[PDB]
A paper describes a structure:
The [name] acts as a DNA sequence-specific transcription factor regulating and activating the expression of a range of target genes in response to genotoxic stress. This in turn initiates a cascade of signal transduction pathways leading to different cellular responses including cell-cycle arrest and apoptosis that are known to prevent cancer development (1–4). [name] binds as a tetramer to specific response elements consisting mainly of two decameric half-sites separated by a variable number of base pairs. The majority of tumor-related [name] mutations, particularly those defined as mutational ‘hotspots’, occur within the DNA-binding core domain of [name] (10). R273, a DNA-contact amino acid, is one of the most frequently altered residues in human cancer (6.4% of all somatic mutations), with mutations to histidine (46.6%) and to cysteine (39.1%) being most common.
In the case of R273H and [name], it was shown that the replacement of threonine by arginine at position 284 ([name]) restores activity to both [name] mutants. Crystal structures of [name] rescued proteins in complexes with DNA were obtained for three double mutants: R273H/[name], [name]/[name] and [name]/S240R. The crystal structure of [name]/[name]-DNA (space group P1) is similar to that of type I complexes with a two base-pair spacer between the DNA half-sites. In the first case, two dodecameric duplexes bound to two [name] core-domain dimers are stacked end-to-end, and hence the decameric half-sites are separated by two base pairs. The loss of protein–DNA contacts as a result of the primary mutations, R273H or [name], is compensated for by a new interaction between the side chain of [name] with the same DNA phosphate oxygen shown to interact with R273 in the wt [name]-DNA complex. In the reactivated double mutants bound to DNA, the shortest distances of the mutated amino acids, histidine and cysteine, from the DNA backbone are close to 4 and 6 Å, respectively. In type I complex of [name]/[name], R248 residues appear occasionally disordered and form water-mediated interactions with the N3 atoms of the two symmetrically disposed adenine bases. The crystal structures of the DNA-contact mutants, R273H and [name], and of the reactivated proteins, demonstrate that [name] inactivation results from the incapacity of the mutated residues to form stabilizing interactions with the DNA backbone, and that [name] rescue can be achieved by alternative protein–DNA interactions formed by the second-site suppressor mutations, [name] and S240R.
Residue numbers in the entry:
A (entry chain D): 95 to 290
B (entry chain C): 96 to 290
C (entry chain B): 94 to 291
D (entry chain A): 96 to 292
The structure:
DNA sequence: CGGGCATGCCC
DNA sequence: GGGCATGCCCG
DNA sequence: CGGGCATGCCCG
DNA sequence: CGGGCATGCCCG
């Protein structure tokens, strides 16, 4: 199917993303590079993504994550787990086995296999920050490596995070590149070295 | 019930031979006598020679089958990984799940054993061409030793059996195999691991 | 294609077999047959005489079909057709479809078949008995693409299968021969003949 | 009707540079100054440097086009042969028929000319990166000079033009190209053949 | 990549 | 027939 | 943890 | 090729 938009749209609520500072130890579980707008993370490890808003979205608002290929020649291809990982015994009880992106720690998560575009996405209700907190954090997990054969096969992906109303209308959108890999700190440091 | 790997030259004096192709980093197929191990690239020609002291009767068949080498893995059927089983690399004759193919023989026959679930590939035995002392079969291995969800860096043995037209055993030999990107580089590594 | 046709020699009830001319190996002779290899070496679009020999005469309605297949088992399911260039080079003889490798010359009753189910190409003419004073029936074939053509045969050897059939397509007889369509048939014949002598 | 090939530096002092990669038998891309001729392998990176004396205005673009070198063949559009046109070698951007592609530039644009039907490939001009004195474009040639039904052993020139945003000419350079299996062998041979006995 | 040789195509 | 130009295999 | 190395694969 | 490097994964 045609590739969903990745255009940054803060919208009426001033929707932005934030990421924890985690450092670049060789095999740190998850690390974000501001200079690349790129997350490096290990398979099945917690990846925190922060939602920041200037004003609070309505009740019933939801937050959706979807992966797409970054490169034009691959844009029409659905991002999914490789044949091996799809057939592994790693089900969390909620996510269909073909889905790359899962959410942990939220029993209200829903998974969509779009009947029109065949793309996968994972969505949770938007909860405003608890009093004393400045942002809302969602814990994602990526369940296949960037390097997997028959899956991403070293082709870079973007994760698109959208804020939507209860009926699915777009309220806001942001995105970040992601590399799922064995050694996120090593690889972040290497990619950062390369723009020099 | 693990297939036998016991060497049996039998009445026809059946032995295997290999081409000695050296250890250039990316040589297609190379055999290590020290290890009795063939190192070869995925989908490329792997020649295996059949040598006999006397000629088996027409109707004789030659079967190849892979098993895991390590005792703890021996009962597991050797098959292509989920990625490679789904690739569009059919030659029109081989089943997509089979690790070992034979190339260049229209009489090739593949078996999924109904009882053991093991895969094998069999061709008719033919005597050497005039002036030649051996019969060469061209095998292809269709998954890397390193493939996740497949061999997963577990060593395999290929067992070559000479059979009569009804399947009775006439001879057996075997060799270890590593299917890899750089067979010359890798042959040298395993050899030095001992001495 | 999902299957492969038989290439087994079958003389049948009429004692059907093939014959070929003695043409020699003068480097660039237009067509030459190697009895040792059962292989015809010829130039693109040049006449390739093939003789049909029979012990008794098949009845009117009998047909003679020619079909190419790849010789190597790993390519045998792939339909032999002309390369993208030759398919488009506007060299029609008025009857042969542009995709067909094998043509027949000089026969107004030639028919070209593109099999709806195997997708294989073939060319067929009515069987005619030999002319007076002759022992055999000669068909003039042409091969319209080189063995070396990219996107075509791509250096893969082919076999031509000649079948004798009744009016319904039932098999009456079969024979086959290898073919290389190349620039220098004499040279290439001699080189391939040398390659056992080694 | 034939596009001009006449070299001229123009007001920005535009000229080309090439990597001097030598003549090892199968070097992937090499350039002969004596012949003003690039020899390169199909689909391999062919770096061409743009050198200017002063920086051209915003919106400047750089176009490449192939034409046959021989006068008898000049009016024929240079295109890929039927085989290569149909190979599964697409980069997702170049039309299947085009001989010349640009690699590693997401802003590449391709043109089939309305009047002449000739093919060209155009990129925005960018000034040299910091610490560099020239701008490099990575071309690929997607058909061999020898291809039957394509160039068929007929020599070609590549014409590189510096253009304003509207397509008006600012500068032009050209070089002969042979796309072949063994660029070093073939370059060394052609240069060996320049002299007398 | 590239030595060795197949294959096109002149003399 | 001779010789060379040019592509391709598999190390 | 970082150092180190095995293994696939790609620029030239 | 074959030197080099990306990437998984082991080891102390
Ligand atoms: Zn995976
Ligand atoms: Zn595999
Ligand atoms: Zn052709
Ligand atoms: Zn071409």
């Amino acid at each position: 199917s045609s590739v969903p938009s990745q255009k940054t749209y803060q919208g009426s609520y001033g929707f932005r993303l934030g990421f924890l500072h985690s450092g670049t130890a060789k095999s740190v579980t998850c690390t974000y590079s501001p200079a690349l707008n790129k997350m490096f993370c290990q398979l099945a490890k917690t990846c925190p993504v922060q939602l920041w808003v200037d004003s609070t979205p309505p009740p019933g608002t939801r937050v959706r994550a979807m992966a797409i290929y970054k490169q034009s020649q691959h844009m029409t291809e659905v991002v999914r787990r490789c044949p091996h990982h799809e057939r592994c015994s790693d089900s969390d009880g909620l996510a269909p086995p073909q889905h790359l992106i899962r959410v942990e720690g939220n029993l209200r998560v829903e998974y969509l296999d779009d009947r029109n575009t065949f793309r996968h996405s994972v969505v949770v209700p938007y909860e405003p920050p608890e009093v004393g907190s400045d942002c809302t954090t969602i814990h994602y997990n990526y369940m296949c490596n960037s390097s997997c054969m028959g899956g991403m096969n070293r082709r870079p992906i973007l994760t698109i995070i959208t804020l939507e109303d209860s009926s699915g209308n777009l309220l806001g959108r942001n995105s970040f590149e992601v590399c799922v890999c064995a050694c996120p700190g090593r690889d972040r440091r290497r990619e950062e070295e390369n723009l020099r």
